[PDB]
Design an enzyme around this catalytic site. Structure first.
Site, PDB file in Angstrom:
ATOM      1  N   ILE D 345       0.820  -1.210   0.000  1.00  0.00           N
ATOM      2  CA  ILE D 345       0.000   0.000   0.000  1.00  0.00           C
ATOM      3  C   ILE D 345       0.851   1.256   0.000  1.00  0.00           C
ATOM      4  O   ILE D 345       0.463   2.278  -0.570  1.00  0.00           O
ATOM      5  CB  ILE D 345      -0.961  -0.004   1.194  1.00  0.00           C
ATOM      6  CG1 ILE D 345      -2.058  -1.010   0.956  1.00  0.00           C
ATOM      7  CG2 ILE D 345      -1.647   1.311   1.328  1.00  0.00           C
ATOM      8  CD1 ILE D 345      -2.849  -1.288   2.180  1.00  0.00           C
ATOM      9  N   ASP D 349       0.079   3.340  -6.242  1.00  0.00           N
ATOM     10  CA  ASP D 349      -0.627   4.600  -6.445  1.00  0.00           C
ATOM     11  C   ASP D 349      -2.075   4.573  -6.000  1.00  0.00           C
ATOM     12  O   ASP D 349      -2.863   5.424  -6.423  1.00  0.00           O
ATOM     13  CB  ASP D 349      -0.574   4.986  -7.920  1.00  0.00           C
ATOM     14  CG  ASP D 349       0.828   5.198  -8.404  1.00  0.00           C
ATOM     15  OD1 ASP D 349       1.587   5.894  -7.707  1.00  0.00           O
ATOM     16  OD2 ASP D 349       1.191   4.681  -9.477  1.00  0.00           O
ATOM     17  N   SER D 374      -7.525   6.209  -5.837  1.00  0.00           N
ATOM     18  CA  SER D 374      -6.516   6.252  -6.915  1.00  0.00           C
ATOM     19  C   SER D 374      -5.781   7.569  -6.740  1.00  0.00           C
ATOM     20  O   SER D 374      -6.383   8.602  -7.016  1.00  0.00           O
ATOM     21  CB  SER D 374      -7.145   6.182  -8.248  1.00  0.00           C
ATOM     22  OG  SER D 374      -6.180   6.421  -9.258  1.00  0.00           O
ATOM     23  N   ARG D 375      -4.524   7.532  -6.318  1.00  0.00           N
ATOM     24  CA  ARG D 375      -3.808   8.794  -6.027  1.00  0.00           C
ATOM     25  C   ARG D 375      -3.659   9.602  -7.316  1.00  0.00           C
ATOM     26  O   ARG D 375      -3.559  10.827  -7.234  1.00  0.00           O
ATOM     27  CB  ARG D 375      -2.489   8.554  -5.295  1.00  0.00           C
ATOM     28  CG  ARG D 375      -2.583   7.686  -4.048  1.00  0.00           C
ATOM     29  CD  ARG D 375      -1.439   8.019  -3.107  1.00  0.00           C
ATOM     30  NE  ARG D 375      -0.761   6.870  -2.525  1.00  0.00           N
ATOM     31  CZ  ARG D 375      -1.328   5.997  -1.706  1.00  0.00           C
ATOM     32  NH1 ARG D 375      -2.599   6.128  -1.381  1.00  0.00           N
ATOM     33  NH2 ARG D 375      -0.626   4.987  -1.225  1.00  0.00           N
ATOM     34  N   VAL D 376      -3.563   8.928  -8.453  1.00  0.00           N
ATOM     35  CA  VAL D 376      -3.396   9.631  -9.750  1.00  0.00           C
ATOM     36  C   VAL D 376      -4.627  10.494  -9.946  1.00  0.00           C
ATOM     37  O   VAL D 376      -4.475  11.657 -10.330  1.00  0.00           O
ATOM     38  CB  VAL D 376      -3.296   8.605 -10.880  1.00  0.00           C
ATOM     39  CG1 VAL D 376      -3.830   9.153 -12.191  1.00  0.00           C
ATOM     40  CG2 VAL D 376      -1.869   8.104 -11.022  1.00  0.00           C
TER      41      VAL D 376
END
Ligand SMILES: Nc1ncnc2c1ncn2[C@@H]1O[C@H](COP(=O)(O)OP(=O)(O)OP(=O)(O)O)[C@@H](O)[C@H]1O
Ligand SMILES: Nc1ncnc2c1ncn2[C@@H]1O[C@H](COP(=O)(O)OP(=O)(O)OP(=O)(O)O)[C@@H](O)[C@H]1O
Ligand SMILES: Nc1ncnc2c1ncn2[C@@H]1O[C@H](COP(=O)(O)OP(=O)(O)O)[C@@H](O)[C@H]1O
Ligand SMILES: [Mg+2]
Ligand SMILES: [Mg+2]
Lengths: 458, 173, 52, 512, 170, 52, 460
Positions: D345, D349, D374-376
C-alpha cells in the site's frame, strides 16, 4: 591500490596495504564494467581489511577488482549554485541541465552545533489548517512531524504546508527525498517549475528504487545544503519526504555488517543513528531552519521502536490515523494524540489554550461513551451525555477541511482559515450557539459561516 | 574443513621462510608436521582436551628435525590458538604461495590416447605463452575424452575433447 | 475452435522436430566412436595446440 | 500444412551454425548442497548476480562471494546435484529473452517455454535486475486504461503507467477482476502480461484456457511458477516478468502487467532468506522485503519522449511508453493493517479493496469505497467519465455509513429516505457479471441514468432489467452516438442533450 | 570456523620470537574500529573498567578483557581513530569534577563546562563508580521533600532519601 | 482435425527416418574436422533409420 | 559393499562420512545394521567434506559411531499396484499386518515431480459421489482437494467408508488411505470396521503410528500418494484419504527443527508453503486418470488465520462441515448445508439449473433458521401463510437430505441407495417449487430418490 575480497549483497570488503588503509567514511572508487562505483567506508577490520557500503548497483562486481582510495569523505555541491536543481546522493546533477557551478563543496558528515549556539523562539507560524494550528500550533525555527501509516495523507498534508507556509516565507527552501515514489518527485518538480517557484528550492533525491547505501546517505546530503543556507545567516525551510526510510535502509545493511540484531530485529545502534541526524537539523543564533518531516509508522503500530524514538525529537507532532480517514474526515488528524510544545497559555494566549483543552475534553469524553453506545446504543445515555455526543460529532466534522491540493480528488474548492476565525468557531460550538445545525453542515467547510450557509442548503 | 583458517599461518610462515632463505627447509618441515597429524595414535590425542601448552610441547617433542628457533615457534602459535589440524592445509597453501612466488605453475593434460612427446612439447610452449609461469605438465590418460586433449590449468579449462564438442552440440538443438 | 486446432499443429511440428534432433546426435555418437580410433586424434590435437 | 522437409532443412541450418572452436572458461566445484542452496569452491572470476551453469540444462544464481567460496541458489530441482560436480561460469548477468515474438507463449521464469509450441523467437536478452528511470525521465499519467467494470472505471480509475493494488481476502474475485482487465485490452492496443507466482497448475491452465476462449491470449505473455517449484524460481518469477514488460515501455508502446500474488513471492523470499540464516524482523520477514517489492513495482512507469528517443537511438520520435502494473495481495480476515499489505500500500498509487462481506452478500465485484482510492485521480479518466462520475464514490461511502446507523435506530427524515433509496439503487446498478465488459459509451449512459435521476419510479428488482433494455435500445436506434462517445470521450451540451432525449424517450416509451 | 584477530604481521612477529619480550605491559595497539567500539591488542596490565588514553585527548573504557584482546568503548567522536594507533593504559578509573562551585553550571558527563560561562571552580574529583553506604550506615527517612503539587504532597509523599519513580507514556 | 493430424503423423515420421541418416552423417563430419568414408557406417545409420 | 561410516548420532539425526567421490544425493536411502535389525536413513543435506546428514527411519538407539553404512542408489522404494489392496504397510512399504509377504511385481520411489503443464487434463469434470448432500451442496471436482472440517463423533469414518464403496462399485476406482500420525487404537478398529463391511478389498492402508519417530510420519504421506499415482497411471480415477493434514505440517516442523533451520511465522518451518505445495500439486487430474483427495483438517486454537490453515485453504476446492446438531436431529449424513461450500458451484462449470437449485435450498434453509428463532421467541402464530409455506418446504428439504448407506445397513437395516445427480436435482427442484407439498415430511426421511419418497408416503 586495494582489492575487493568479499561481496555480500550491498556490502563490499576491500583489502589495503597496512600503511595505506582508509579512514572511516572515506570514499573509495571502483570500475564496475563501464560504470564508476563509489564505496563508503563503514568499519576498519583487522589486517588492512575495510568494510564498505556500495553507493550504487552491486551487481557485476568480481573479486579482485582494483579499488582507488580517494582520501576524503563524500563531498557535495553547496550554496546558491545548488538552487533550482535536482541532485544525487553523491551531489551529481540528475536533471538534464549542465554542470552545477558550485564555488564550494562540504562533507556530508558533520557535527551538530554546540549547546552554546542554540536559539529559541516563541513566534507562532500561521497555517491554513484548522486542526493543526488549533491543536498543535508550531513556531518559526522549530520541528514538525507528521506520523501515519500507509496511505493516510502524510504527503498531501506536507504539500499543503508547502503551499501555505511559502505564502509568508521569502527565503530559500530545501527538499530531501528519502525513499518515496519517483512519480511524486516528478509531479512536484513540474508543479514547482510551472509556478516559477523552483528558483528558490534545492532538491535531493534518493528514491526507493536505489540500493541501500544511497537511501541511507541521501538524508545527510539534504541536511548539508540546508546547513549552508543557515550558516550564510538566512532562514530556511527543510522538508523531508519520509525519514523512516533512513532507519530502514540502516536495518537492511546492519546484519551484513556483522552485528547482532536488537529488539524487533533492528540494528543495535538505532538510537544513535537517529540522533546523529536529527541533532544537526536545528536553528541557531546565526540563522534558523524550519522543518517538516513525514514519519511512516509500520503496520499502523505507533509503539514500534522507530516511531517511538522519533517522537522525542520533535516540537510539534501530528498523528494521522486510518480510522478517521476511513470515515472520510480529512485531514485525518487525531486531536487526542496530536500535540505541540507551543500550546501554552503564555505562548498562545488563554482563549486559544482554553478552546483547545475544551475540544480535547469533549472528544475524550466521547471516547469514554463509545463502549456503552456500542453495546446498548444511544438511548440509554444520560440526557446531557446525549448532548456531549452531539457536540463531539459536530466538532469531529468541523475539524475537516477542503485543501487546494485535494481538488484533484474532492473537486471541491479549497479553503484557508485564519487562527482567529477557527478558535471563534470552536468556542461557539462548545458554547452551543450552533447546537441547532445538523452534523452534515460542518463537513468540509472552511469557516463557521460556511456551515450555517450549508445548513441553509441542507 | 580448515581451508579458511589456514591462510594466515600459511602466509606468515612463507614470508618468514622467504626472509631466511630456508623455504626448501620450511616445506620439508611442514610436510613432516603434516604427516605426524595423520597418525592413528596422534589424531586421537589432537582431539582430546589436553591443555594447549602441554599439547604443544608434546607435538614439539615428536617434531624432531624442525627449526627450533622458528619452525617450533609457528607450531606453538598455532596450538596456542588450537588449529593444528589446519597444518595439512597450511602445507598445501604454503606450496601454492611458493609456486606463485617462484612464478611456476603445474597444469594437467588429459586424453584417451597417451600423448606423443611432440604434442607435450608444443603444449608446454603454448601454455608458457598463455601464462607468465613455467609449466610442469602432468599426463593423465582417460578414455572419457574419446579424442582430443583436455587442458586443465586448475580452475581455467580449455576443452578440446570430441565428447565435449558433442554434448555441446546436443544442447544447441 | 480454430485456435485450438492451430495449437495442435504447432505441438505436432515441435514433437517431431525434437525426435529428429536427438536421433542426429545419437547417430553422430555412434559414427564417431567407431571411426576415430586413428591418428585422426593427432589432427585434432595439433589444431588445438595451435589455437591454444 | 505440416512439412517434413522444412524440419530437416532447419536442423541442417543448426548443424551449419555450430562453432567447433572452444573458449577458456572459469570452473568450480560444488562443495555443499541443502534446500536448494549451494556452496561452491572455485569460480575466481565469478561476479555477484551471475548465472552459473550446472550439469544438465539448469542454472544457479551467485548470491554471496565469500572469501573462499560462492553461495548460490539452484533454479530448478536441486536434488540430483552432488558435492564434487563441476560448474561453469557464464559471463552473463541473469538474463531473460525479450521481444514481441513472446506474445501467445507460456514461459518459465528462466525464459524457457513451458507450452508445447516449441522454441522461442526473441529479440535478444534483457537483464532481470534493473534500476528504474530517474525522476527526470518520467511523465505524468494522463491516459485511461479502461477495465470492463462500472465500479472501478467510475470510482477508482486507472491510468497508463499507474500502479494499482488489488487487495482482499481469498475467494473474493481478485483474479477475475485482473483477467477481465486483460481481456478488455484485447482490442485497446495495450499488450498484456500475466505472472502466476505459486499458483496451482490446474488454475493456471484454466486461466490460459479462458484467455484463449475470449481471444485475448494472442495479446498476452504468460509467466508461470507453480506451487511445486523451487522457491528461488518463485522469488525471481516477478522480476523476470518485469523485464519483458520493460521491452515495450522502452520502445514507446503500452503494456499492462499482473502479478498474481506478491504475498506468495514474499513467503518464497522469506524461505530463502531464512535458509541463509538472515536475522528476521516483523512477522519474520527480513527488512529487505520492502526493498524486494519496491524495486519491482517502481519499474511500472511512464516515460517521456526524450527517454524513448535516447533509448532507441532516435528510431522512435515523440512517442511515450508506459508499463501499467496491477499487483495482487491476499490479506488474512480482511486485515489491511498487517505488514506486507501495508508495505505494498505504501508503494502503489492506490488500492482496490475487495470485501468478503459484500461478496457474500452477492454484491460483486465487491469494491469497498472509502478505503479504495486512486492517487493519480481523474487525470486517468476521460472527460465524460470524469464529469459523470464525480462524487459517486463519497456518496456511496456515506450511504454505507448512514445504513450502519439507520440499522441501529429509527430516525427517518425524508432526505435520509431518498439518500437510502438512491444508494441502494446505485449499488444494485454497480454490480456486474464476470466476462461481460461494457464500453465507455455503455458505462456513461448507465452513470447518466443514475445521476440525472431517471431511476426514479424504477424498482430495485427492475434495475437490472432497466439497464439490459436500455443498452439494447441504444444499440438498436441511437447507435451513431455510441460510436462517437467510444471514439472521443467528449462531454458536450450537444451530447448531454442527446443523452437526455434518449433517457427521456426510453423512460417514457419503453418497458423493462 | 572463523579467525580471532590472528593476522599475518602479528603471527610473523610471533614466528620471530614466540616468547616475545615483556616490553611494556602498559601499552598496545588498536586493531579494529567500528561503531565506537575498538579492539586493542596488548595491554597485558589493563584492568577491567580502567581508562585507556587515546591519540589526541580522548579515552576509552576497558569493558571486555579477553584472551589477547581488550574491548573498549570510546568516550567521544571515534571516527577519527585508525588501526595501528598506539594506546596507553592509565592507572585511573573514571573520575569527575565535584564540588559546590558546580551549582548553576551546565556540564557534560565528563564535567566539562558546556554553557560557556568559563572554567569550573570545583573541589577536587570523585570516582564515577562507587559503592553505596551499607545497612548500618543508613538512617530512616522522616523529613519531607516538598513537591508543591497538591496531589503529590498529599497522596504520594516524598521524604529525604526516598527513590520515587515517575512513570507514564510520552 | 485430429484425425487429419494422425494421417500426416505416419507420413512425416517415415520421411524423417531417411533424412535422419543424412543429418547424422553431416553432423559427425562437422564435429570432427576430417570426413568419414562410411566404410563400416551403413549398418549404423540403418539402425537409426529403423527406430523412428 | 558398505562404504560410509557413522560420524555422529544426535537423537534422530545421524551424520555419515562417505568417500569424497561417492557422496549420496539428497533423499537417497541408506541402510545400517542396528544390532540384529536393519535401519533405513534418508539423506537431508550434503555438508562439506563427504559428510552427509540424515534422519533415521526408526529408533536410533544402539547405533555406534563407526558402523558401516551401505549406499542404496535410490530413494525409499515401496510396492505398488493391485497386490497392495487390503494390506497394511508402514512408511517403508513393509507389511505390518501378519498376512505375510506382498506380491510386488514392481516397486517405485516415493519422490517425484508433479505432472507437467501439458499433462494436465484439458477439461473440468465433476465426481459423482452418490450422496445427496455432497453432490448438490458441495460438488467435487474430479482431481480436487476436499476438506472434512468436523470433529469425531459425527460419522467421519462411515462417510469415508461410503465413498470408498461407491467409487469402487459405481465407478472402477480404488482408494488409498494414509494414516498420518494416527493413534494405534483407532488404526486397529478402523481396520476391523472395514473388514467387517467388505470394503477392505478395495482400499490400501499405510499407517504412520504416532509412536514412530518424526521422519516416519512425514514420509507416510508420500507413500500413500505414490500408490495412488500407480493406480492413476493404470488409468483409474482414485480417492486418496489423508487422515490428518495438520499432522503432516507438524511433522515437517519437527524435522526442520531437528535439522536446525531457522523458524518462520508462528514458529513453523521456513519451507511450510513449499512442503504443502509438494504434496498437494501431485494430486490432480491428468490425461490418463485422476486422484481426488479427501483430507481431514484440524484448525489450531480455532484460528483460521494461523499459517497451517491459511496455507492449506489455498489448496482446497471443496469444504464439508459435519455437525453434532444435525446428528442430534438423527439426520445422516450429518453434513451442514450452510457452512459446507464448494468453489465448483458456478453456472460456468456446473450449469445454471444446478446452481439455481443449490442457491435455492440454501436460501430456504437460511430463512428457516431466522424463522425458527422467531418461533422460539414468539410461537408459530406470528407466521404468515408465506412463512408457513417456507417452514414446511424447509422441513421437507431437511428430511430429504438424509440417506441410507450400504455401510449403514448394520444399524438402520434399510438397503443402501446410490443417487445420481439428475435425481437429486429433480427432487430438490420439486420440493422447492411446491410440488409434493401434499405428502408428509416423514416420507422424505432416509428414503432415497424423490420417486421413492412418494412411494414411501402411500402407506406411511
Ligand atoms: N485532504 C484530503 N482530501 C481528500 N483526499 C485525501 C486527503 N488527504 C489524503 N487523501 C487521500 O488519501 C491518499 C493518501 O495520502 P497521501 O497521498 O499523502 O499518501 P500518504 O498518506 O502520504 O502515503 P505515503 O506515505 O505512502 O505517501 C491521498 O492521495 C488521497 O487519495
Ligand atoms: N462478477 C462476478 N459475479 C459473480 N461471481 C463472480 C464474479 N467474479 C468472480 N466471481 C466468482 O468468484 C469466485 C472466485 O473467483 P476468483 O478465483 O477470481 O476469486 P479470487 O479471490 O481471485 O480467488 P483466489 O483468491 O482463489 O485466487 C468464483 O466462483 C468466481 O466465479
Ligand atoms: N448413516 C448413519 N446411520 C446410523 N448411524 C450413523 C450414521 N452415520 C453415523 N452414525 C453414527 O455416528 C456415530 C459416530 O460415527 P463414527 O464414524 O464413529 O464417527 P467417529 O469415528 O468420527 O467418532 C456412531 O454412533 C455411528 O453409528
Ligand atoms: Mg507518504
Ligand atoms: Mg485469484
Amino acid at each position: 591500490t586495494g582489492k575487493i575480497v568479499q561481496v555480500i549483497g550491498a556490502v563490499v570488503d576491500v583489502e589495503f596495504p597496512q600503511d595505506a588503509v582508509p579512514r572511516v567514511y572515506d570514499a573509495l572508487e571502483v570500475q564496475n564494467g563501464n560504470e564508476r562505483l563509489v564505496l563508503e567506508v563503514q568499519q576498519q577490520l583487522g589486517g588492512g581489511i575495510v568494510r564498505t557500503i556500495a553507493m550504487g548497483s552491486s551487481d557485476g562486481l568480481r573479486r579482485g577488482l582494483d579499488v582507488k582510495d580517494l582520501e576524503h569523505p563524500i563531498e557535495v555541491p553547496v550554496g546558491k549554485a545548488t538552487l533550482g536543481r535536482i541532485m544525487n546522493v553523491l551531489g551529481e546533477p540528475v536533471d538534464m541541465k549542465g554542470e552545477i557551478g558550485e564555488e564550494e563543496r562540504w562533507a556530508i558528515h558533520r557535527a551538530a552545533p554546540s549547546y552554546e549556539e542554540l536559539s529559541n523562539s516563541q513566534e507562532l507560524l500561521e497555517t491554513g489548517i484548522k486542526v493543526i494550528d488549533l491543536m498543535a500550533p508550531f513556531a518559526k525555527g522549530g520541528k514538525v512531524g507528521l506520523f501515519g501509516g500507509a496511505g493516510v495523507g502524510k504527503t498531501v498534508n506536507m504539500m499543503e504546508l508547502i503551499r501555505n507556509i511559502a505564502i509568508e516565507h521569502s527565503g530559500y527552501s530545501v527538499f530531501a527525498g528519502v525513499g518515496e515514489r519517483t512519480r511524486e518527485g516528478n509531479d512536484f518538480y513540474h508543479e514547482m517549475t510551472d509556478s516559477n517557484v523552483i528558483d528558490k528550492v534545492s532538491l535531493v533525491y534518493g528514491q526507493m528504487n536505489e540500493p541501500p547505501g544511497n537511501r541511507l546517505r541521501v538524508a545527510l546530503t539534504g541536511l548539508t545544503m540546508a546547513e549552508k543556507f543557515r550558516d550564510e545567516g538566512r532562514d530556511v525551510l527543510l522538508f523531508v519526504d519520509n525519514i523512516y526510510r533512513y532507519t530502514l535502509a540502516g536495518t537492511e545493511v546492519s546484519a551484513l555488517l556483522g552485528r547482532m540484531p536488537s529488539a524487533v530485529g533492528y540494528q543495535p545502534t538505532l538510537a544513535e543513528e537517529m540522533g546523529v541526524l536529527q541533532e544537526r537539523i536545528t536553528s541557531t543564533k546565526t540563522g534558523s531552519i524550519t522543518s517538516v518531516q513525514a514519519v511512516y509508522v509500520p503496520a499502523d503500530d505507533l509503539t514500534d521502536p522507530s516511531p517511538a524514538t522519533t517522537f522525542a525529537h520533535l516540537d510539534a507532532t501530528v498523528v494521522l490515523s486510518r480510522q478517521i480517514a476511513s470515515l472520510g474526515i480529512y485531514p485525518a488528524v487525531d486531536p487526542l494524540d496530536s500535540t505541540s510544545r507551543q500550546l501554552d497559555p503564555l505562548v498562545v494566549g488563554q482563549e486559544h489554550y482554553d478552546t483547545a483543552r475544551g475540544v480535547q475534553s469533549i472528544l475524550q469524553r466521547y471516547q469514554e461513551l463509545k463502549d456503552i453506545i456500542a453495546i446498548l446504543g444511544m438511548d440509554e445515555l444520560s440526557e446531557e451525555d446525549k448532548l456531549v455526543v452531539a457536540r463531539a460529532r459536530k466538532i469531529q466534522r468541523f475539524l475537516s477541511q477542503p485543501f487546494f491540493v485535494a481538488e484533484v480528488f474532492t473537486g471541491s474548492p479549497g479553503k484557508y482559515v485564519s487562527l482567529k476565525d477557527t478558535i471563534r468557531g470552536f468556542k461557539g460550538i462548545m458554547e452551543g450557539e450552533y447546537d441547532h445545525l445538523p452534523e452534515q453542515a460542518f463537513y468540509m467547510v472552511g469557516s463557521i459561516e460556511e456551515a450555517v450557509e450549508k445548513a441553509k442548503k441542507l | 574443513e580448515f581451508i579458511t583458517v589456514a591462510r594466515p599461518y600459511a602466509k606468515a610462515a612463507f614470508d618468514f621462510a622467504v626472509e631466511h632463505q630456508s623455504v626448501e627447509r620450511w616445506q620439508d618441515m611442514l610436510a613432516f608436521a603434516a604427516e605426524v597429524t595423520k597418525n592413528e595414535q596422534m589424531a586421537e590425542l589432537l582431539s582430546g582436551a589436553l591443555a594447549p601448552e602441554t599439547l604443544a610441547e608434546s607435538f614439539i617433542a615428536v617434531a624432531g628435525e624442525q627449526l627450533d628457533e622458528n619452525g617450533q615457534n609457528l607450531i606453538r602459535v598455532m596450538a596456542e590458538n588450537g588449529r593444528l589440524n589446519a597444518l595439512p592445509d597450511v602445507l598445501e597453501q604454503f606450496i601454492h604461495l611458493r609456486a606463485v612466488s617462484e612464478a611456476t605453475a603445474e597444469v594437467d593434460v588429459i586424453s584417451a590416447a597417451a600423448l606423443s612427446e611432440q604434442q607435450l612439447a608444443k603444449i608446454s610452449a603454448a601454455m608458457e605463452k598463455r601464462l607468465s609461469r613455467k609449466v610442469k605438465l602432468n599426463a593423465k590418460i582417460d578414455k572419457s575424452v574419446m579424442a582430443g586433449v583436455i587442458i586443465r590449468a586448475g580452475d581455467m579449462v580449455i576443452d578440446g575433447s570430441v565428447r565435449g564438442r558433442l554434448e555441446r552440440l546436443a544442447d544447441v538443438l | 475452435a480454430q485456435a485450438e486446432i492451430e495449437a495442435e499443429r504447432k505441438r505436432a511440428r515441435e514433437e517431431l522436430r525434437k525426435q529428429v534432433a536427438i536421433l542426429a546426435v545419437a547417430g553422430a555418437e555412434k559414427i564417431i566412436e567407431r571411426s576415430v580410433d586413428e591418428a585422426a586424434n593427432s589432427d585434432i590435437v595439433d589444431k588445438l595446440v595451435a589455437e591454444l | 500444412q505440416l512439412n517434413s522437409t522444412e524440419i530437416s532443412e532447419l536442423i541442417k541450418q543448426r548443424i551449419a551454425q555450430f562453432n567447433v572452436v572452444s573458449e577458456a572458461h572459469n570452473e568450480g566445484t560444488i562443495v555443499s548442497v541443502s534446500d536448494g542452496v549451494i556452496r561452491i569452491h572455485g569460480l575466481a572470476d565469478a561476479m555477484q548476480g551471475e548465472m552459473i551453469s550446472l550439469p544438465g540444462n539448469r542454472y544457479a544464481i551467485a548470491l554471496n562471494l565469500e572469501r573462499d567460496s560462492v553461495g548460490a541458489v539452484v533454479m530448478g530441482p536441486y536434488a540430483d546435484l552432488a558435492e564434487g560436480m563441476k560448474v561453469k561460469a557464464t559471463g552473463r548477468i541473469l538474463e531473460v529473452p525479450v521481444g514481441r515474438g513472446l506474445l501467445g507463449r507460456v514461459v518459465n521464469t528462466l525464459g524457457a517455454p513451458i507450452d508445447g509450441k516449441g522454441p522461442l523467437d526473441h529479440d535478444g536478452f534483457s537483464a532481470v535486475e534493473a534500476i528504474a528511470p530517474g525522476v527526470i525521465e518520467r511523465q505524468s499519467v494522463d491516459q485511461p486504461v479502461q477495465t470492463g467494470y462500472k465500479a472501478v472505471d467510475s470510482m477508482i480509475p486507472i491510468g497508463r503507467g499507474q500502479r494499482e493494488l488489488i487487495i482482499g481476502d481469498r475467494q473474493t474475485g481478485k483474479t477475475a477482476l485482473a483477467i477481465d482487465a486483460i481481456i478488455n485490452q484485447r482490442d485497446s492496443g495495450i499488450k498484456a502480461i500475466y505472472v502466476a507466482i505459486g499458483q496451482k497448475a490446474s488454475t493456471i491452465s484454466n486461466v490460459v484456457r479462458k484467455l484463449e476462449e475470449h481471444g485475448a491470449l494472442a495479446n498476452t505473455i504468460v509467466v508461470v511458477a507453480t506451487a511445486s517449484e523451487s522457491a528461488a524460481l518463485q522469488y525471481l518469477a516477478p522480476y523476470a516478468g518485469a523485464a519483458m514488460g520493460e521491452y515495450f515501455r522502452d520502445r514507446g508502446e503500452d503494456a499492462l502487467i499482473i502479478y498474481d500474488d506478491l504475498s506468495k513471492q514474499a513467503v518464497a523470499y522469506r524461505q530463502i532468506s531464512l535458509l541463509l540464516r538472515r536475522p528476521p524482523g516483523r512477522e519474520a520477514f527480513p527488512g529487505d522485503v520492502f526493498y524486494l517489492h519496491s524495486r519491482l513495482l517502481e519499474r511500472a512507469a511512464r516515460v517521456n519522449a526524450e527517454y524513448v528517443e535516447a533509448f532507441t537511438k532516435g528510431e522512435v520520435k515523440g512517442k511515450t511508453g508506459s508499463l501499467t502494473a496491477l499487483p495482487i495481495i491476499e490479506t488474512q480476515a480482511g486485515d489491511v493493517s498487517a505488514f506486507v499489505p501495508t508495505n505494498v500500500i505504501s508503494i502503489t498509487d492506490g488500492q482496490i479493496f475487495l470485501e468478503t462481506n459484500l461478496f457474500n452478500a452477492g454484491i460483486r465485484p465487491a469494491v469497498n469505497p472509502g478505503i479504495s482510492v486512486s492517487r493519480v485521480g481523474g487525470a486517468a479518466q476521460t472527460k465524460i467519465m470524469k464529469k459523470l462520475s464525480g462524487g459517486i464514490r463519497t456518496a456511496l461511502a456515506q450511504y454505507r455509513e448512514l445504513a450502519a446507523f439507520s440499522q441501529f435506530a429509527s430516525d427517518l427524515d425524508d432526505a435520509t429516505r431518498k439518500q437510502l433509496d438512491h444508494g441502494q439503487k446505485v449499488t444494485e446498478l454497480l454490480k456486474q457479471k464476470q466476462y461481460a465488459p461494457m464500453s465507455v459509451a455503455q458505462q456513461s449512459l448507465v452513470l447518466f441514468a443514475a445521476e440525472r435521476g431517471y431511476l426514479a419510479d424504477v424498482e430495485l428488482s427492475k434495475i437490472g432489467s432497466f439497464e439490459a433494455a436500455l443498452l439494447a435500445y441504444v444499440d438498436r436506434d441511437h447507435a451513431p452516438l455510441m460510436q462517437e462517445i467510444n471514439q472521443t470521450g467528449g462531454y458536450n451540451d450537444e451530447i448531454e442533450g442527446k443523452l437526455k432525449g434518449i433517457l427521456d424517450s426510453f423512460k417514457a416509451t419503453q418497458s423493462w
